[PDB]
Design a protein around this ligand. Structure first.
Ligand SMILES: NCCCCCC(=O)O
Length: 79
């Protein structure tokens, strides 16, 4: 349930936002269109809709399935 450092190395199966939203899959362009695809970042573990941090943010995050909300941090603690 926890990520180390900045979450850059996190490769867990959590997929829920802090708000309790569900993560959009990185390969998906819906509802939010973006460029952080497993296609463009083949080495950042952009697998299914798992919380990740391909941009060196401060914790694992994801795009959200809430059309209203583009992205949020995931509901995780820092180890
Ligand atoms: N760390 C969250 C980033 C928000 C924008 C991501 C993107 O639009 O590629």
């Amino acid at each position: 349930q926890c990520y180390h450092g900045n979450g850059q190395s996190y490769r867990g199966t959590f997929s829920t936002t802090v708000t309790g939203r569900t993560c959009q899959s990185w390969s998906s362009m819906t509802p939010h269109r973006h460029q952080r695809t497993p296609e463009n970042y083949p080495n950042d573990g952009l697998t299914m809709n798992y919380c990740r941090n391909p941009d060196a943010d401060t914790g694992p995050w994801c795009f959200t399935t809430d059309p209203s909300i583009r992205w949020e941090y995931c509901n995780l603690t820092r180890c």
